[PDB]
């Protein structure tokens, strides 16, 4: 898969390049993974559903840990069904995620989105302050019309669909368990309609370089089975790229019920 020594040297070289001596001192240290596929990821159809890749090392808790000295702190928004907004109170989440240190800042629903946050200015202002948006999978398919087309231009504002129902009933245990799994293990990735896939690994101050190496190893070994990948790069913002994977063989792939109902309902 990935040479561990080579990727260790790559991460160490990037983290040496980051400190040679506005947003100028902050935007340039975000580590990015570029995946280039031979063919289109989705096909002819756009997708908004983020692909959740599991990693062994926690990611969002370091974000809240390191965001205490930042302008915008890490915030989690949760969107549930309108009929299920009455089954959840803030203490019900507090006593079920106080051990994990997870705090849900604000819970909304479709009615709240369609009434309180209808105007574009209010909608963008409310959305822009949140960093992790988790949605019920039942309601997640109505979200492009409500949250708008601006919210899907960035990864962090793109909603995450999580399973909230057990035995065709609402389950607080299931909802909290899915939230815990997302907060600990999995990361969201934006599947593009081109060939250039971007992964935001995180920030150099969030995690140690060895943990970045392990996470990128697990992501690469998982994506190998996910698709026939072609090229893999690791980079930092405002800096060039470093290749880490290459393969050749996957390049060789480059080159009426309606009328029956009408007949049944018509006379002859």
């Amino acid at each position: 898969a990935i040479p561990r020594e080579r990727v260790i040297k790559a991460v160490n070289e990037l983290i040496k390049f980051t400190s040679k001596p506005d947003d100028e001192e902050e935007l340039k240290k975000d580590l990015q993974l570029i995946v280039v596929n031979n063919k289109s990821f989705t096909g002819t159809s756009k997708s908004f559903k983020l692909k959740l890749l599991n990693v062994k090392h926690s990611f969002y808790k370091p974000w809240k840990e390191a965001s205490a000295t930042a302008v915008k702190d890490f915030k989690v928004l949760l969107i549930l069904k309108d009929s299920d907004i009455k089954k959840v109170s803030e203490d019900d989440l507090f006593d079920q995620l106080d051990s994990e240190g997870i705090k849900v800042d604000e819970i909304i629903c479709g009615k709240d989105l369609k009434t309180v946050y209808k105007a574009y200015e209010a909608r963008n202002a409310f959305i822009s302050q949140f960093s992790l948006i988790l949605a019920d999978d039942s309601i997640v398919t109505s979200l492009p019309k409500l949250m708008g087309g601006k919210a899907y231009n960035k990864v962090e504002t793109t909603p995450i669909s999580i399973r909230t129902h057990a035995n065709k009933e609402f389950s607080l245990t299931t909802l909290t368990n899915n939230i815990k799994k997302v907060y600990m293990n999995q990361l969201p990735v934006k599947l593009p309609r081109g060939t250039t896939l971007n992964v935001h690994l995180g920030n150099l101050e969030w995690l140690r370089p060895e943990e970045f190496v392990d996470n990128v190893e697990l992501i690469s070994e998982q994506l190998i089975k996910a698709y026939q990948i072609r090229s893999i790069f690791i980079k930092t913002n405002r800096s060039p790229v470093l290749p880490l994977y290459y393969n050749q063989d996957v390049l060789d792939e480059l080159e009426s019920t309606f009328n029956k109902g009408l007949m049944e309902i018509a006379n002859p």
Binding site: K9, E13, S40, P240, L242, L251, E255
Partner: protein, 133 residues
């Protein structure tokens, strides 16, 4: 002075060419109706132009619809001065994508990507980077 050309802006989501012509025919005969739209998707730009046969009818339409509050949008209507005719507003459509063919053979594209990888290596060596291969 004034021409028979009307600039309309802050148009709602559903107001398009057919809607605009249908509404302003009641104020007068229309010589040309155009609506600004995005080139790559069939979405209105929320402004457009109309031309009346009668400049008096253009003035009346403006003084009637200049500050009409419509579906959360306060309409804006102006009469254009002499000259300045309307042009270059084509009715664009929502474009689709299709995969084009490749005339470069497999060996040629492999050689090209090998050369690109070599140039990447040379650029990394240029930029003070000590990385293997």
């Amino acid at each position: 002075e004034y021409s028979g050309i009307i600039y309309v802006s802050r148009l709602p989501h559903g107001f398009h060419e057919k809607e605009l012509s249908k509404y302003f025919a009641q104020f007068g005969d229309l010589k040309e109706v155009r609506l600004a739209r995005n080139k790559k998707t069939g979405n209105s730009r929320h402004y457009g132009f109309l031309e009346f046969v009668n400049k008096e009818d253009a003035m009346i339409a403006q003084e009637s619809m200049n500050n009409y509050l419509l579906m959360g949008h306060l309409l804006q209507v102006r009469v254009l001065p002499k000259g300045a005719k309307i042009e270059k507003l084509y009715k664009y459509k929502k474009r689709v994508l299709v995969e084009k063919g490749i005339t470069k053979p497999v060996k040629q594209l492999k050689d090209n990507m090998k050369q690109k990888h070599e140039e990447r290596i040379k650029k990394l060596a240029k930029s003070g980077i000590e990385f293997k291969w």
